[PDB]
Amino acid sequence: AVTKSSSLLIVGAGTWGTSTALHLARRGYTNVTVLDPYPVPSAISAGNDVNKVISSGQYSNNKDEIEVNEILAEEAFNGWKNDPLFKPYYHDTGLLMSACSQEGLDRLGVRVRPGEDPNLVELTRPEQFRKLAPEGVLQGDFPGWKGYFARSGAGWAHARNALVAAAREAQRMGVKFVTGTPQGRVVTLIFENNDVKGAVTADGKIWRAERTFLCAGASAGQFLDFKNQLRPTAWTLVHIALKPEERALYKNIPVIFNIERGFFFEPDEERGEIKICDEHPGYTNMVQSADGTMMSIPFEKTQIPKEAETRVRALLKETMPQLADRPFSFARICWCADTANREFLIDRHPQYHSLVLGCGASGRGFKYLPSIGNLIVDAMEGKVPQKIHELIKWNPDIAANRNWRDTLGRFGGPNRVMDFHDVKEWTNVQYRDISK
Numbered sequence: 001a002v003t004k005s006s007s008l009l010i011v012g013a014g015t016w017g018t019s020t021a022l023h024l025a026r027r028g029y030t031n032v033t034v035l036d037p038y039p040v041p042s043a044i045s046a047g048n049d050v051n052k053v054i055s056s057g058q059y060s061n062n063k064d065e066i067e068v069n070e071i072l073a074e075e076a077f078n079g080w081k082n083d084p085l086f087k088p089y090y091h092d093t094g095l096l097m098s099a100c101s102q103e104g105l106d107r108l109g110v111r112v113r114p115g116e117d118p119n120l121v122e123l124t125r126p127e128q129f130r131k132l133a134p135e136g137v138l139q140g141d142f143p144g145w146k147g148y149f150a151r152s153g154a155g156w157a158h159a160r161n162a163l164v165a166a167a168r169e170a171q172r173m174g175v176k177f178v179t180g181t182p183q184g185r186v187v188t189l190i191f192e193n194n195d196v197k198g199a200v201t202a203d204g205k206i207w208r209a210e211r212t213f214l215c216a217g218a219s220a221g222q223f224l225d226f227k228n229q230l231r232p233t234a235w236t237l238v239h240i241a242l243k244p245e246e247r248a249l250y251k252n253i254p255v256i257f258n259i260e261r262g263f264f265f266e267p268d269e270e271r272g273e274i275k276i277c278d279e280h281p282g283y284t285n286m287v288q289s290a291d292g293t294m295m296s297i298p299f300e301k302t303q304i305p306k307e308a309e310t311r312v313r314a315l316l317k318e319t320m321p322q323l324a325d326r327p328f329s330f331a332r333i334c335w336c337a338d339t340a341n342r343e344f345l346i347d348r349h350p351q352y353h354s355l356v357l358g359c360g361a362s363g364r365g366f367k368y369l370p371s372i373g374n375l376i377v378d379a380m381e382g383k384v385p386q387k388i389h390e391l392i393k394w395n396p397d398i399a400a401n402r403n404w405r406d407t408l409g410r411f412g413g414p415n416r417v418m419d420f421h422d423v424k425e426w427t428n429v430q431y432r433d434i435s436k
């Protein structure tokens with residue numbers, strides 16, 4: 001019974017909240033408000049990054065899960081390739097996907113499905129890896145690396161610039177963004193007569209809405225009982241700034257990715273900075289409540305654990321050893337939230353009639369920026385196809401008996417899901433306000 005002018009409220013102006021705002025606006029809605037405790041682009045948004053990988057990789061070997069993920073990935077790629085708003089930010093550089101151990105290579109097979117793509121080049125010798133870039137870039141020995149190179153049809157997007165472009169387009173189409181603290185910091189949803197009626201912000205403003213979308217990423221569990229469906233989990237990233245004289249050499253290189261070591265990208269234009277991530281199964285931040293119950297609580301930090309730095313420099317030694325001792329120009333932790341099987345959680349709430357969930361991006365949601373809003377709007381409108389709905393629906397049963405330490409098909413570092421409570425030392429990198 002929504003009209004196009006019904007008050008709609010989105011909690012979170014991150015990747016999926018912004019996508020939702022954009023798609024509501026495109027679909028004719030004229031009374032949408034988005035709330036976020038940070039200015040766009042949010043400093044705690046996982047999407048606020050100079051690059052993200054865009055590729056069609058799979059996360060399951062189950063036929064039904066593969067089919068649904070293919071549908072959603074095709075829609076996202078369509079956006080990056082064909083939507084004038086998103087095309088500017090996508091760079092089809094190609095992508096190397098690799099591993100080292102037998103367990104890693106098994107996982108690589110599931111992810112890459114090399115038998116389905118004759119275009120992939122198989123790499124098994126160090127010289128083959130070095131030849132992916134001009135002489136002097138990939139100087140390392142790539143010890144034990146084996147993988148598959150996609151020459152095109154995969155690459156990277158300028159995540160921050162795409163996020164900002166989408167928000168600014170939503171805004172010019174009439175979406176209200178209320179950002180910053182306290183005005184955009186939601187402190188509770190409004191619970192009235194067994195429904196959610198909107199939200200209250202930290203400035204003590206009451207925001208009533210006909211429908212509320214919860215798109216708060218790793219923080220979503222603060223607001224609602226997810227019945228153990230979400231595990232807030234964090235990853236680590238650094239930048240190294242190349243000198244102006246050395247930047248040309250590194251331009252246009254493919255994304256280099258080993259699922260047991262880490263990955264990096266060509267340098268950004270603004271600062272000539274290479275972004276590097278050490279791969280691992282993630283950090284939780286498990287706190288015990290007065291109940292004695294367990295929950296992972298996100299926090300902002302513009303540093304990484306020293307152990308993460310060690311893993312980054314180890315990766316660089318194997319690939320770009322000439323850079324392995326360079327000081328970092330930027331470092332941060334980056335949060336998302338994993339469902340029990342890393343499938344998305346996009347549905348109407350089963351009891352709260354007015355609430356729509358758009359979360360559980362499971363550390364792989366950025367690439368859906370162009371498209372995921374359509375699916376979240378479909379959920380509000382009741383238009384999700386049964387096939388897709390079955391995979392992404394509200395699902396407490398999959399999260400019952402939950403193992404919080406499940407590595408969920410990820411590898412690297414200690415091959416354990418770690419915890420920030422175990423971290424004793426952090427880096428000392430210069431602060432940068434990425435909300436600009």
Ligand SMILES: Cc1cc2nc3c(=O)[nH]c(=O)nc-3n(C[C@H](O)[C@H](O)[C@H](O)COP(=O)(O)OP(=O)(O)OC[C@H]3O[C@@H](n4cnc5c(N)ncnc54)[C@H](O)[C@@H]3O)c2cc1C
Nearest residue numbers: 012014015016042045046053186216217334361365366367
């Ligand atoms: C290091 C790293 C690398 C990654 N690499 C890739 C990749 O290569 N490719 C890919 O596809 N994905 C990648 N991902 C995953 C991807 O970034 C996330 O899955 C995706 O961005 C999550 O989107 P989201 O909208 O759910 O959350 P976010 O974009 O994090 O947005 C959550 C929003 O909630 C807001 N919020 C928090 N508290 C409140 C509050 N109290 N009130 C209102 N709003 C609030 C926050 O300010 C934030 O803006 C990566 C993630 C990380 C951390």
Ligand SMILES: O=C(O)CSC[C@@]1(O)OC[C@@H](O)[C@@H](O)[C@@H]1O
Nearest residue numbers: 053055235277279362363364410
């Ligand atoms: O979706 C992709 O193609 C890359 S996600 C990159 C990454 O850093 O995202 C965060 C976590 O899911 C990590 O395991 C993972 O390697």
